[PDB]
PDB file of C-alpha atoms and ligand atoms in Angstrom:
ATOM      1  CA  UNK A 107       0.000   0.000   0.000  1.00 25.59           C
ATOM      2  CA  UNK A 108       1.431   3.345  -1.105  1.00 24.19           C
ATOM      3  CA  UNK A 109       0.798   6.714   0.530  1.00 26.68           C
ATOM      4  CA  UNK A 110      -2.171   7.847  -1.569  1.00 30.61           C
ATOM      5  CA  UNK A 111      -3.932   4.505  -1.008  1.00 33.52           C
ATOM      6  CA  UNK A 112      -3.887   4.927   2.774  1.00 34.08           C
ATOM      7  CA  UNK A 113      -4.922   8.589   2.631  1.00 36.26           C
ATOM      8  CA  UNK A 114      -7.900   7.767   0.411  1.00 36.79           C
ATOM      9  CA  UNK A 115      -8.744   5.000   2.883  1.00 37.46           C
ATOM     10  CA  UNK A 116      -8.568   7.508   5.749  1.00 38.78           C
ATOM     11  CA  UNK A 117     -10.797   9.970   3.885  1.00 39.08           C
ATOM     12  CA  UNK A 118     -13.305   7.232   3.049  1.00 38.92           C
ATOM     13  CA  UNK A 119     -13.329   5.794   6.581  1.00 35.03           C
ATOM     14  CA  UNK A 120     -14.016   9.267   7.993  1.00 35.25           C
ATOM     15  CA  UNK A 121     -17.183   9.277   5.878  1.00 35.86           C
ATOM     16  CA  UNK A 122     -18.136   5.866   7.286  1.00 32.48           C
ATOM     17  CA  UNK A 123     -17.609   7.217  10.814  1.00 32.68           C
ATOM     18  CA  UNK A 124     -19.930  10.217  10.487  1.00 32.33           C
ATOM     19  CA  UNK A 125     -22.568   7.919   8.936  1.00 32.00           C
ATOM     20  CA  UNK A 126     -22.262   5.127  11.520  1.00 32.34           C
ATOM     21  CA  UNK A 127     -24.679   4.525  14.377  1.00 33.84           C
ATOM     22  CA  UNK A 128     -23.100   2.384  17.113  1.00 33.14           C
ATOM     23  CA  UNK A 129     -19.642   2.279  18.693  1.00 35.29           C
ATOM     24  CA  UNK A 130     -18.577  -0.995  17.051  1.00 30.30           C
ATOM     25  CA  UNK A 131     -18.589   0.511  13.549  1.00 32.08           C
ATOM     26  CA  UNK A 132     -16.723   3.695  14.482  1.00 31.78           C
ATOM     27  CA  UNK A 133     -14.202   1.574  16.379  1.00 31.08           C
ATOM     28  CA  UNK A 134     -14.018  -0.719  13.343  1.00 27.00           C
ATOM     29  CA  UNK A 135     -13.561   2.203  10.946  1.00 30.10           C
ATOM     30  CA  UNK A 136     -11.056   3.956  13.224  1.00 29.22           C
ATOM     31  CA  UNK A 137      -9.032   0.738  13.468  1.00 29.50           C
ATOM     32  CA  UNK A 138      -8.921   0.618   9.668  1.00 27.32           C
ATOM     33  CA  UNK A 139      -7.620   4.186   9.806  1.00 29.61           C
ATOM     34  CA  UNK A 140      -4.935   2.966  12.203  1.00 24.62           C
ATOM     35  CA  UNK A 141      -4.342  -0.009   9.902  1.00 21.55           C
ATOM     36  CA  UNK A 142      -4.056   2.158   6.783  1.00 18.37           C
ATOM     37  CA  UNK A 143      -1.695   4.527   8.603  1.00 21.48           C
ATOM     38  CA  UNK A 144       0.341   1.551   9.837  1.00 20.67           C
ATOM     39  CA  UNK A 145       0.826  -0.034   6.405  1.00 21.88           C
ATOM     40  CA  UNK A 146       1.957   3.273   4.857  1.00 21.32           C
ATOM     41  CA  UNK A 147       4.236   4.267   7.751  1.00 21.18           C
ATOM     42  CA  UNK A 148       7.472   3.571   5.856  1.00 21.91           C
ATOM     43  CA  UNK A 149       5.943   4.648   2.528  1.00 24.26           C
ATOM     44  CA  UNK A 150       6.710   7.900   0.679  1.00 25.08           C
ATOM     45  CA  UNK A 151       4.339  10.118  -1.338  1.00 25.34           C
ATOM     46  CA  UNK A 152       5.024  10.396  -5.086  1.00 25.53           C
ATOM     47  CA  UNK A 153       6.226  13.964  -4.469  1.00 29.44           C
ATOM     48  CA  UNK A 154       9.107  13.378  -2.032  1.00 27.65           C
ATOM     49  CA  UNK A 155      10.818  10.185  -3.245  1.00 28.21           C
ATOM     50  CA  UNK A 156      13.386  12.545  -4.813  1.00 28.84           C
ATOM     51  CA  UNK A 157      14.027  14.043  -1.351  1.00 28.75           C
ATOM     52  CA  UNK A 158      16.253  12.410   1.235  1.00 31.91           C
ATOM     53  CA  UNK A 159      15.177  10.358   4.264  1.00 30.73           C
ATOM     54  CA  UNK A 160      17.271  12.876   6.240  1.00 30.48           C
ATOM     55  CA  UNK A 161      15.920  15.965   4.469  1.00 33.40           C
ATOM     56  CA  UNK A 162      13.785  18.308   6.609  1.00 36.52           C
ATOM     57  CA  UNK A 163      11.111  18.397   3.891  1.00 36.53           C
ATOM     58  CA  UNK A 164      10.440  14.656   4.181  1.00 38.24           C
ATOM     59  CA  UNK A 165      11.024  14.420   7.932  1.00 38.79           C
ATOM     60  CA  UNK A 166       8.210  16.973   8.023  1.00 36.43           C
ATOM     61  CA  UNK A 167       6.174  14.258   6.307  1.00 39.25           C
ATOM     62  CA  UNK A 168       7.336  11.729   8.916  1.00 40.47           C
ATOM     63  CA  UNK A 169       6.229  13.763  11.946  1.00 40.14           C
ATOM     64  CA  UNK A 170       2.995  14.860  10.278  1.00 36.21           C
ATOM     65  CA  UNK A 171       2.115  11.288   9.335  1.00 34.88           C
ATOM     66  CA  UNK A 172       2.839   9.914  12.812  1.00 33.44           C
ATOM     67  CA  UNK A 173       0.974  12.869  14.319  1.00 32.19           C
ATOM     68  CA  UNK A 174      -1.989  11.645  12.273  1.00 30.69           C
ATOM     69  CA  UNK A 175      -1.498   8.135  13.674  1.00 29.14           C
ATOM     70  CA  UNK A 176      -1.439   9.272  17.309  1.00 27.73           C
ATOM     71  CA  UNK A 177      -4.607  11.322  16.803  1.00 29.72           C
ATOM     72  CA  UNK A 178      -6.243   8.178  15.395  1.00 29.93           C
ATOM     73  CA  UNK A 179      -5.302   6.267  18.541  1.00 29.25           C
ATOM     74  CA  UNK A 180      -6.881   9.027  20.620  1.00 27.38           C
ATOM     75  CA  UNK A 181     -10.048   8.574  18.544  1.00 31.80           C
ATOM     76  CA  UNK A 182      -9.995   4.770  18.821  1.00 34.05           C
ATOM     77  CA  UNK A 183      -9.989   5.492  22.575  1.00 33.73           C
ATOM     78  CA  UNK A 184     -13.354   7.219  22.986  1.00 35.13           C
ATOM     79  CA  UNK A 185     -14.974   4.636  20.705  1.00 35.81           C
ATOM     80  CA  UNK A 186     -13.631   1.844  22.914  1.00 33.01           C
ATOM     81  CA  UNK A 187     -14.633   3.645  26.131  1.00 33.85           C
ATOM     82  CA  UNK A 188     -18.235   3.884  24.886  1.00 35.72           C
ATOM     83  CA  UNK A 189     -18.022   7.651  24.253  1.00 37.95           C
ATOM     84  CA  UNK A 190     -19.153   7.100  20.682  1.00 38.43           C
ATOM     85  CA  UNK A 191     -19.989  10.750  19.941  1.00 39.95           C
ATOM     86  CA  UNK A 192     -16.908  12.337  21.516  1.00 41.39           C
ATOM     87  CA  UNK A 193     -15.020   9.924  19.260  1.00 42.83           C
ATOM     88  CA  UNK A 194     -17.014  11.157  16.260  1.00 42.02           C
ATOM     89  CA  UNK A 195     -16.267  14.704  17.409  1.00 42.26           C
ATOM     90  CA  UNK A 196     -12.611  13.667  17.649  1.00 44.11           C
ATOM     91  CA  UNK A 197     -12.881  12.082  14.197  1.00 49.13           C
ATOM     92  CA  UNK A 198     -14.183  15.381  12.799  1.00 50.52           C
ATOM     93  CA  UNK A 199     -11.053  17.235  13.910  1.00 49.88           C
ATOM     94  CA  UNK A 200      -9.110  14.193  12.691  1.00 49.28           C
ATOM     95  CA  UNK A 201     -10.440  14.931   9.193  1.00 51.07           C
ATOM     96  CA  UNK A 202      -8.787  18.357   9.423  1.00 49.34           C
ATOM     97  CA  UNK A 203      -5.422  16.712  10.088  1.00 49.13           C
ATOM     98  CA  UNK A 204      -6.099  14.191   7.311  1.00 49.99           C
ATOM     99  CA  UNK A 205      -7.175  16.861   4.810  1.00 49.91           C
ATOM    100  CA  UNK A 206      -4.218  19.142   5.563  1.00 49.14           C
ATOM    101  CA  UNK A 207      -1.675  16.306   5.423  1.00 46.89           C
ATOM    102  CA  UNK A 208      -3.192  14.970   2.196  1.00 44.17           C
ATOM    103  CA  UNK A 209      -3.393  18.264   0.296  1.00 42.06           C
ATOM    104  CA  UNK A 210       0.266  19.219   0.735  1.00 43.69           C
ATOM    105  CA  UNK A 211       1.434  15.800  -0.523  1.00 44.36           C
ATOM    106  CA  UNK A 212      -1.293  14.264  -2.708  1.00 46.16           C
ATOM    107  CA  UNK A 213      -0.889  14.753  -6.459  1.00 46.37           C
TER     108      UNK A 213
ATOM    109  CA  UNK B 283      -2.946   3.122  20.118  1.00 49.61           C
ATOM    110  CA  UNK B 284      -2.028   2.652  23.778  1.00 46.34           C
ATOM    111  CA  UNK B 285      -2.452  -0.526  25.815  1.00 45.61           C
ATOM    112  CA  UNK B 286      -5.902   0.159  27.276  1.00 46.93           C
ATOM    113  CA  UNK B 287      -7.270   1.029  23.818  1.00 47.97           C
ATOM    114  CA  UNK B 288      -6.343  -2.382  22.409  1.00 47.28           C
ATOM    115  CA  UNK B 289      -7.602  -4.269  25.468  1.00 42.52           C
ATOM    116  CA  UNK B 290     -10.971  -2.512  25.293  1.00 39.26           C
ATOM    117  CA  UNK B 291     -11.026  -3.383  21.589  1.00 39.45           C
ATOM    118  CA  UNK B 292     -10.318  -7.032  22.439  1.00 36.19           C
ATOM    119  CA  UNK B 293     -13.075  -7.075  25.067  1.00 33.05           C
ATOM    120  CA  UNK B 294     -15.539  -5.454  22.662  1.00 33.44           C
ATOM    121  CA  UNK B 295     -14.626  -7.740  19.750  1.00 31.92           C
ATOM    122  CA  UNK B 296     -15.163 -10.790  21.972  1.00 29.57           C
ATOM    123  CA  UNK B 297     -18.740  -9.569  22.435  1.00 28.90           C
ATOM    124  CA  UNK B 298     -19.118  -9.238  18.657  1.00 32.67           C
ATOM    125  CA  UNK B 299     -17.841 -12.809  18.254  1.00 34.70           C
ATOM    126  CA  UNK B 300     -20.350 -14.442  20.606  1.00 35.29           C
ATOM    127  CA  UNK B 301     -23.139 -12.455  18.898  1.00 36.27           C
ATOM    128  CA  UNK B 302     -22.051 -13.204  15.317  1.00 36.73           C
ATOM    129  CA  UNK B 303     -23.669 -15.764  13.036  1.00 37.58           C
ATOM    130  CA  UNK B 304     -21.352 -16.736  10.164  1.00 36.69           C
ATOM    131  CA  UNK B 305     -17.615 -17.403   9.921  1.00 39.37           C
ATOM    132  CA  UNK B 306     -16.780 -14.190   8.044  1.00 39.32           C
ATOM    133  CA  UNK B 307     -17.725 -11.969  10.994  1.00 37.55           C
ATOM    134  CA  UNK B 308     -15.887 -14.010  13.630  1.00 37.98           C
ATOM    135  CA  UNK B 309     -12.859 -14.112  11.332  1.00 39.73           C
ATOM    136  CA  UNK B 310     -13.273 -10.361  10.810  1.00 43.69           C
ATOM    137  CA  UNK B 311     -13.584  -9.699  14.546  1.00 45.29           C
ATOM    138  CA  UNK B 312     -10.714 -12.055  15.419  1.00 41.73           C
ATOM    139  CA  UNK B 313      -8.500 -10.297  12.865  1.00 42.48           C
ATOM    140  CA  UNK B 314      -9.300  -6.993  14.571  1.00 45.08           C
ATOM    141  CA  UNK B 315      -8.223  -8.652  17.815  1.00 46.49           C
ATOM    142  CA  UNK B 316      -4.971  -9.596  16.090  1.00 50.34           C
ATOM    143  CA  UNK B 317      -4.770  -6.057  14.702  1.00 53.84           C
ATOM    144  CA  UNK B 318      -5.375  -4.437  18.095  1.00 57.51           C
ATOM    145  CA  UNK B 319      -2.793  -6.737  19.691  1.00 58.23           C
ATOM    146  CA  UNK B 320      -0.343  -5.936  16.883  1.00 57.59           C
ATOM    147  CA  UNK B 321      -0.603  -2.149  17.212  1.00 56.04           C
ATOM    148  CA  UNK B 322      -0.080  -2.277  20.996  1.00 54.42           C
ATOM    149  CA  UNK B 323       2.764  -4.818  20.883  1.00 50.48           C
ATOM    150  CA  UNK B 324       5.485  -2.283  21.727  1.00 48.81           C
ATOM    151  CA  UNK B 325       3.138  -0.269  23.966  1.00 50.86           C
ATOM    152  CA  UNK B 326       3.239  -0.181  27.782  1.00 51.35           C
ATOM    153  CA  UNK B 327       0.322   0.002  30.246  1.00 51.63           C
ATOM    154  CA  UNK B 328       0.068   3.167  32.369  1.00 54.50           C
ATOM    155  CA  UNK B 329       1.164   1.084  35.372  1.00 51.60           C
ATOM    156  CA  UNK B 330       4.577  -0.176  34.210  1.00 54.54           C
ATOM    157  CA  UNK B 331       6.136   2.750  32.311  1.00 51.86           C
ATOM    158  CA  UNK B 332       8.103   3.367  35.531  1.00 50.23           C
ATOM    159  CA  UNK B 333       9.466  -0.200  35.306  1.00 49.74           C
ATOM    160  CA  UNK B 334      12.344  -1.182  33.055  1.00 47.39           C
ATOM    161  CA  UNK B 335      12.155  -2.925  29.669  1.00 47.29           C
ATOM    162  CA  UNK B 336      14.506  -5.479  31.275  1.00 48.43           C
ATOM    163  CA  UNK B 337      12.585  -5.756  34.551  1.00 47.46           C
ATOM    164  CA  UNK B 338      10.889  -9.121  35.205  1.00 48.35           C
ATOM    165  CA  UNK B 339       7.639  -7.340  36.104  1.00 48.28           C
ATOM    166  CA  UNK B 340       7.286  -5.844  32.616  1.00 49.05           C
ATOM    167  CA  UNK B 341       8.768  -8.805  30.745  1.00 48.54           C
ATOM    168  CA  UNK B 342       5.909 -10.658  32.429  1.00 47.80           C
ATOM    169  CA  UNK B 343       3.688  -8.217  30.540  1.00 44.39           C
ATOM    170  CA  UNK B 344       5.595  -8.964  27.321  1.00 45.31           C
ATOM    171  CA  UNK B 345       5.128 -12.746  27.464  1.00 43.51           C
ATOM    172  CA  UNK B 346       1.528 -12.457  28.646  1.00 46.38           C
ATOM    173  CA  UNK B 347       0.665 -10.037  25.849  1.00 44.57           C
ATOM    174  CA  UNK B 348       2.286 -12.174  23.146  1.00 47.97           C
ATOM    175  CA  UNK B 349       0.663 -15.259  24.673  1.00 52.14           C
ATOM    176  CA  UNK B 350      -2.626 -13.445  24.072  1.00 50.16           C
ATOM    177  CA  UNK B 351      -1.600 -12.799  20.457  1.00 48.68           C
ATOM    178  CA  UNK B 352      -0.738 -16.439  19.739  1.00 47.06           C
ATOM    179  CA  UNK B 353      -4.052 -17.599  21.209  1.00 47.81           C
ATOM    180  CA  UNK B 354      -5.786 -15.133  18.872  1.00 47.13           C
ATOM    181  CA  UNK B 355      -4.002 -16.684  15.898  1.00 46.74           C
ATOM    182  CA  UNK B 356      -5.198 -20.105  17.036  1.00 45.13           C
ATOM    183  CA  UNK B 357      -8.739 -18.687  17.080  1.00 47.07           C
ATOM    184  CA  UNK B 358      -8.390 -17.019  13.667  1.00 47.58           C
ATOM    185  CA  UNK B 359      -7.525 -20.563  12.524  1.00 47.70           C
ATOM    186  CA  UNK B 360     -10.790 -22.375  13.249  1.00 46.72           C
ATOM    187  CA  UNK B 361     -12.752 -19.446  11.811  1.00 48.21           C
ATOM    188  CA  UNK B 362     -10.751 -19.689   8.584  1.00 49.41           C
ATOM    189  CA  UNK B 363     -11.056 -23.496   8.455  1.00 47.38           C
ATOM    190  CA  UNK B 364     -14.860 -23.205   8.632  1.00 48.72           C
ATOM    191  CA  UNK B 365     -15.034 -24.504  12.227  1.00 46.00           C
ATOM    192  CA  UNK B 366     -16.955 -21.403  13.239  1.00 45.30           C
ATOM    193  CA  UNK B 367     -18.164 -22.740  16.604  1.00 45.02           C
ATOM    194  CA  UNK B 368     -14.897 -24.314  17.762  1.00 45.26           C
ATOM    195  CA  UNK B 369     -13.464 -20.858  17.060  1.00 45.13           C
ATOM    196  CA  UNK B 370     -16.193 -19.285  19.199  1.00 47.42           C
ATOM    197  CA  UNK B 371     -15.407 -21.891  21.855  1.00 44.68           C
ATOM    198  CA  UNK B 372     -11.745 -20.922  21.470  1.00 46.52           C
ATOM    199  CA  UNK B 373     -12.741 -17.252  21.679  1.00 50.53           C
ATOM    200  CA  UNK B 374     -14.539 -17.941  24.969  1.00 51.64           C
ATOM    201  CA  UNK B 375     -11.352 -19.244  26.586  1.00 52.19           C
ATOM    202  CA  UNK B 376      -9.578 -16.347  24.860  1.00 55.84           C
ATOM    203  CA  UNK B 377     -11.753 -13.985  26.919  1.00 54.32           C
ATOM    204  CA  UNK B 378     -10.304 -15.587  30.058  1.00 57.85           C
ATOM    205  CA  UNK B 379      -6.784 -14.730  28.898  1.00 57.71           C
ATOM    206  CA  UNK B 380      -7.955 -11.240  27.909  1.00 57.13           C
ATOM    207  CA  UNK B 381      -9.761 -10.639  31.213  1.00 57.80           C
ATOM    208  CA  UNK B 382      -6.854 -11.882  33.339  1.00 56.84           C
ATOM    209  CA  UNK B 383      -4.252  -9.896  31.386  1.00 57.52           C
ATOM    210  CA  UNK B 384      -6.417  -6.764  31.490  1.00 56.56           C
ATOM    211  CA  UNK B 385      -7.269  -6.827  35.201  1.00 56.43           C
ATOM    212  CA  UNK B 386      -3.676  -7.018  36.447  1.00 58.91           C
ATOM    213  CA  UNK B 387      -2.640  -4.039  34.281  1.00 57.48           C
ATOM    214  CA  UNK B 388      -5.714  -1.910  33.515  1.00 58.07           C
ATOM    215  CA  UNK B 389      -6.255   1.102  35.775  1.00 60.33           C
TER     216      UNK B 389
ATOM    217  CA  UNK C 132      -1.149 -16.033  12.836  1.00 59.32           C
ATOM    218  CA  UNK C 133       0.649 -18.740  10.862  1.00 60.24           C
ATOM    219  CA  UNK C 134       0.920 -18.963   7.080  1.00 60.28           C
ATOM    220  CA  UNK C 135      -2.112 -21.163   6.394  1.00 62.04           C
ATOM    221  CA  UNK C 136      -4.321 -18.908   8.542  1.00 63.27           C
ATOM    222  CA  UNK C 137      -3.555 -15.848   6.413  1.00 63.75           C
ATOM    223  CA  UNK C 138      -3.925 -17.731   3.123  1.00 60.70           C
ATOM    224  CA  UNK C 139      -7.337 -19.063   4.150  1.00 59.23           C
ATOM    225  CA  UNK C 140      -8.229 -15.496   5.131  1.00 59.16           C
ATOM    226  CA  UNK C 141      -7.117 -14.274   1.695  1.00 58.09           C
ATOM    227  CA  UNK C 142      -9.153 -16.978  -0.052  1.00 54.42           C
ATOM    228  CA  UNK C 143     -12.217 -16.186   2.061  1.00 53.61           C
ATOM    229  CA  UNK C 144     -11.895 -12.414   1.612  1.00 54.13           C
ATOM    230  CA  UNK C 145     -11.695 -12.878  -2.166  1.00 53.68           C
ATOM    231  CA  UNK C 146     -15.123 -14.521  -1.940  1.00 56.74           C
ATOM    232  CA  UNK C 147     -16.419 -11.548   0.062  1.00 59.39           C
ATOM    233  CA  UNK C 148     -15.061  -9.200  -2.620  1.00 57.79           C
ATOM    234  CA  UNK C 149     -16.827 -10.834  -5.570  1.00 55.75           C
ATOM    235  CA  UNK C 150     -20.061 -10.873  -3.523  1.00 55.61           C
ATOM    236  CA  UNK C 151     -19.823  -7.266  -2.298  1.00 53.88           C
ATOM    237  CA  UNK C 152     -21.784  -4.348  -3.715  1.00 53.11           C
ATOM    238  CA  UNK C 153     -20.171  -1.011  -2.806  1.00 50.24           C
ATOM    239  CA  UNK C 154     -16.569   0.198  -2.630  1.00 49.38           C
ATOM    240  CA  UNK C 155     -16.406   0.343   1.178  1.00 50.05           C
ATOM    241  CA  UNK C 156     -16.747  -3.436   1.547  1.00 51.15           C
ATOM    242  CA  UNK C 157     -14.208  -4.327  -1.146  1.00 51.38           C
ATOM    243  CA  UNK C 158     -11.822  -1.783   0.367  1.00 50.42           C
ATOM    244  CA  UNK C 159     -12.576  -3.280   3.788  1.00 51.28           C
ATOM    245  CA  UNK C 160     -12.018  -6.836   2.548  1.00 52.87           C
ATOM    246  CA  UNK C 161      -8.886  -5.889   0.589  1.00 52.17           C
ATOM    247  CA  UNK C 162      -7.461  -4.199   3.691  1.00 50.93           C
ATOM    248  CA  UNK C 163      -8.026  -7.434   5.610  1.00 45.45           C
ATOM    249  CA  UNK C 164      -6.102  -9.168   2.830  1.00 43.02           C
ATOM    250  CA  UNK C 165      -3.309  -6.650   3.383  1.00 42.33           C
ATOM    251  CA  UNK C 166      -3.663  -7.197   7.134  1.00 43.17           C
ATOM    252  CA  UNK C 167      -3.531 -10.992   6.833  1.00 44.35           C
ATOM    253  CA  UNK C 168      -0.506 -10.738   4.533  1.00 45.23           C
ATOM    254  CA  UNK C 169       1.143  -8.313   6.968  1.00 47.79           C
ATOM    255  CA  UNK C 170       0.741 -10.524  10.045  1.00 44.82           C
ATOM    256  CA  UNK C 171       2.165 -13.577   8.241  1.00 46.60           C
ATOM    257  CA  UNK C 172       5.047 -11.706   6.582  1.00 47.70           C
ATOM    258  CA  UNK C 173       7.733 -13.195   8.844  1.00 48.14           C
ATOM    259  CA  UNK C 174       5.875 -16.519   9.130  1.00 49.08           C
ATOM    260  CA  UNK C 175       6.886 -19.782   7.426  1.00 50.01           C
ATOM    261  CA  UNK C 176       4.642 -22.488   5.923  1.00 48.23           C
ATOM    262  CA  UNK C 177       4.715 -25.911   7.619  1.00 48.37           C
ATOM    263  CA  UNK C 178       6.625 -27.225   4.589  1.00 46.68           C
ATOM    264  CA  UNK C 179       9.728 -24.999   4.630  1.00 47.50           C
ATOM    265  CA  UNK C 180      10.604 -24.564   8.324  1.00 45.00           C
ATOM    266  CA  UNK C 181      13.247 -27.251   7.677  1.00 43.35           C
ATOM    267  CA  UNK C 182      14.730 -25.039   4.930  1.00 46.94           C
ATOM    268  CA  UNK C 183      17.036 -22.124   5.632  1.00 45.75           C
ATOM    269  CA  UNK C 184      16.143 -18.417   5.688  1.00 45.45           C
ATOM    270  CA  UNK C 185      18.962 -18.086   3.124  1.00 48.57           C
ATOM    271  CA  UNK C 186      17.906 -21.074   1.012  1.00 50.89           C
ATOM    272  CA  UNK C 187      16.624 -20.259  -2.499  1.00 51.44           C
ATOM    273  CA  UNK C 188      13.584 -22.492  -1.937  1.00 54.69           C
ATOM    274  CA  UNK C 189      12.312 -20.340   0.940  1.00 54.50           C
ATOM    275  CA  UNK C 190      13.477 -17.012  -0.486  1.00 52.68           C
ATOM    276  CA  UNK C 191      11.225 -18.033  -3.373  1.00 54.11           C
ATOM    277  CA  UNK C 192       8.471 -18.044  -0.751  1.00 54.93           C
ATOM    278  CA  UNK C 193       9.590 -14.598   0.446  1.00 59.65           C
ATOM    279  CA  UNK C 194       9.401 -12.921  -2.973  1.00 63.98           C
ATOM    280  CA  UNK C 195       6.180 -14.715  -3.896  1.00 63.13           C
ATOM    281  CA  UNK C 196       4.524 -13.700  -0.633  1.00 63.52           C
ATOM    282  CA  UNK C 197       5.574 -10.051  -0.931  1.00 62.28           C
ATOM    283  CA  UNK C 198       4.556 -10.104  -4.597  1.00 61.08           C
ATOM    284  CA  UNK C 199       1.116 -11.087  -3.307  1.00 60.00           C
ATOM    285  CA  UNK C 200       1.201  -8.157  -0.870  1.00 60.59           C
ATOM    286  CA  UNK C 201       2.084  -5.581  -3.533  1.00 61.08           C
ATOM    287  CA  UNK C 202      -0.703  -6.847  -5.797  1.00 60.04           C
ATOM    288  CA  UNK C 203      -3.094  -6.402  -2.859  1.00 60.50           C
ATOM    289  CA  UNK C 204      -1.987  -2.786  -2.493  1.00 57.05           C
ATOM    290  CA  UNK C 205      -2.665  -2.265  -6.195  1.00 56.55           C
ATOM    291  CA  UNK C 206      -6.171  -3.644  -5.594  1.00 56.14           C
ATOM    292  CA  UNK C 207      -6.755  -1.514  -2.484  1.00 57.66           C
ATOM    293  CA  UNK C 208      -5.977   1.374  -4.864  1.00 53.19           C
ATOM    294  CA  UNK C 209      -8.856   1.074  -7.332  1.00 55.00           C
ATOM    295  CA  UNK C 210     -11.280   0.484  -4.456  1.00 56.34           C
ATOM    296  CA  UNK C 211     -10.102   3.703  -2.804  1.00 54.96           C
ATOM    297  CA  UNK C 212     -10.199   5.652  -6.089  1.00 54.19           C
ATOM    298  CA  UNK C 213     -13.858   4.674  -6.571  1.00 54.14           C
ATOM    299  CA  UNK C 214     -13.084   2.239  -9.419  1.00 57.16           C
ATOM    300  CA  UNK C 215     -14.889  -0.508  -7.541  1.00 58.56           C
ATOM    301  CA  UNK C 216     -15.170  -2.916 -10.490  1.00 60.49           C
ATOM    302  CA  UNK C 217     -11.631  -2.529 -11.838  1.00 58.10           C
ATOM    303  CA  UNK C 218     -10.621  -3.395  -8.273  1.00 56.78           C
ATOM    304  CA  UNK C 219     -12.846  -6.483  -8.386  1.00 58.56           C
ATOM    305  CA  UNK C 220     -11.288  -7.299 -11.758  1.00 58.10           C
ATOM    306  CA  UNK C 221      -7.892  -6.797 -10.111  1.00 58.39           C
ATOM    307  CA  UNK C 222      -9.028  -8.979  -7.204  1.00 55.87           C
ATOM    308  CA  UNK C 223      -9.936 -11.751  -9.658  1.00 53.26           C
ATOM    309  CA  UNK C 224      -6.382 -11.902 -11.003  1.00 51.97           C
ATOM    310  CA  UNK C 225      -5.254 -11.561  -7.379  1.00 55.11           C
ATOM    311  CA  UNK C 226      -7.008 -14.874  -6.677  1.00 55.48           C
ATOM    312  CA  UNK C 227      -4.753 -16.480  -9.295  1.00 53.86           C
ATOM    313  CA  UNK C 228      -1.674 -15.290  -7.404  1.00 54.10           C
ATOM    314  CA  UNK C 229      -3.258 -16.398  -4.119  1.00 49.28           C
ATOM    315  CA  UNK C 230      -4.249 -19.826  -5.465  1.00 49.68           C
ATOM    316  CA  UNK C 231      -0.846 -20.488  -7.045  1.00 48.56           C
ATOM    317  CA  UNK C 232       1.085 -19.352  -3.960  1.00 50.07           C
ATOM    318  CA  UNK C 233      -1.177 -21.388  -1.670  1.00 48.56           C
ATOM    319  CA  UNK C 234      -1.106 -24.658  -3.619  1.00 47.81           C
ATOM    320  CA  UNK C 235       2.687 -24.975  -3.757  1.00 45.71           C
ATOM    321  CA  UNK C 236       2.988 -24.434   0.019  1.00 43.96           C
ATOM    322  CA  UNK C 237      -0.303 -25.395   1.696  1.00 45.66           C
ATOM    323  CA  UNK C 238      -0.466 -28.909   3.145  1.00 43.42           C
TER     324      UNK C 238
HETATM  325 CA1   CA D  62     -26.959   6.660   8.821  1.00 42.09          CA
HETATM  326 CA1   CA D  63     -27.344 -12.520  17.111  1.00 47.81          CA
HETATM  327 CA1   CA D  64     -24.560 -10.080  -3.457  1.00 45.01          CA
HETATM  328 CU1   CU D  65       2.885  -4.131  11.580  1.00 48.03          CU
END
């Protein structure tokens, strides 16, 4: 799975979260977000493969991507604790982090 | 995903398993149990972060957590082989391992 | 999760893909295929554990297994891009790679 596959999975799963009804689905969808972010952890967007693993421009991508992953884990939390709507509220701000990270590296 | 997020996912997925009907769901839910246990493999419960990675008290947590993971894989087995109920019977004993591991490290 | 557990998951998820209707399910099922292939990446089939990690017969298994994983990522693509049927067409050829890899290492 390359970078744009996981990001499109994140964006699609966020739509499944806002349209879900129970806590099992939002926990299921958030875990897929964690799964998609886990598979593309070592991946590189098609914009930065010509920039070094030690370059600040791509290490920006490394902190921003793992910042996305830790916010997902905070959202998986409230879904597991039963707070299904605070998780959906946390998933709404998560879409901001997903949208911003995707736009500056997508096409 | 921290330790208590995965354990609450395990406990919730065990409830989805006993309430499922086919083999695809129990295989789906058991794979999420494997996924939750995989994401929190290197994690540490909020009780032992002040105990060393080489301490016997936390290496107890490392064997007990990976013992949980290998029992999950044995349960993913029977669900994949079509033995949907022997998997649910294996998931019931899996809840014992999940409950015992969670209680001695949860809050 | 051992090797035959993931392969039976792949074979079962391929049946869920051809029977699905939207793009969320096929993306969900394809991500489980990526998940099953990820958990059994370092695993070894019950036929080759008596053959070295540096032997060509098992390194054949290593390239063939990771070739399966990269074809999955190409299938997760079209499902995420909305091309739900080109993904199902890509999942049909994926079953060929799954069947061939499974038969020469299964029992
Ligand atoms: Ca609805
Ligand atoms: Ca029922
Ligand atoms: Ca149908
Ligand atoms: Cu992993």
